[PDB]
Amino acid sequence: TKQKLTSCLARRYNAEQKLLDLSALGTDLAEKSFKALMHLVSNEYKDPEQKNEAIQAVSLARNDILDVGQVYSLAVTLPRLRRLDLSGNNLENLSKISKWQQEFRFLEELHLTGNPVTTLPNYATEIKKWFPSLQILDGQQIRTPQEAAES
């Protein structure tokens, strides 16, 4: 199991992009199954600094995620995450993201394309407010680099 999960994580890690691709896990999801992955990624690195530098980006795209509570511990495991892809899930409104208020303080790029929350009137305004380092939301620049240097 640990061997199988470790092998899966290795196959899904792109060193060149510093990216851990956890998209579409159901095709090879559950909070306790996700917690297990997070425990394994935490155990990989003896130095948190190396972990922080190795995994700068994560995709959780296409996982039928209804609430970020489902994958909450990503915020604990990778507090210095810079890029996050949550595209192609089913996050319906801002309350489905609010469990990550005050987390991902260093996140610079966020993708929510394909989630219903993106079409609500206060979407971009609130997401900008909640994540102070965010420069790109769905490919749209929402903070200039100088703006972000001050946020």
Numbering used by the authors: 196 to 223, 237 to 359
Paper text:
The Mex67–Mtr2 complex (NXF1–NXT1 in metazoans and small bristles in Drosophila melanogastor) is the principal mRNA-export factor in Sacccharomyces cerevisiae. Mex67/NXF1 is a modular protein constructed from four domains: an RNA-recognition motif (RRM) domain, a leucine-rich repeat (LRR) domain, a nuclear transport factor 2-like (NTF2L) domain and an ubiquitin-associated (UBA) domain. Mtr2 is a ∼15–20 kDa protein that also has an NTF2-like fold and forms a tight heterodimeric complex with the Mex67 NTF2L domain.
Classically, binding of the RNA cargo has been attributed to the RRM and LRR domains because together these domains are sufficient for Homo sapiens NXF1 to bind the viral RNA CTE (constitutive transport element) sequence motif. d for the ctMex67LRR-NTF2L–Mtr2 (RRM domain deletion) was 6.8 µM, whereas that for ctMex67RRM-LRR (NTF2L–Mtr2 region deletion) was 5.5 µM. These data indicated that as in S. cerevisiae the RRM, LRR and NTF2L–Mtr2 regions all contribute to RNA binding by ctMex67–Mtr2.
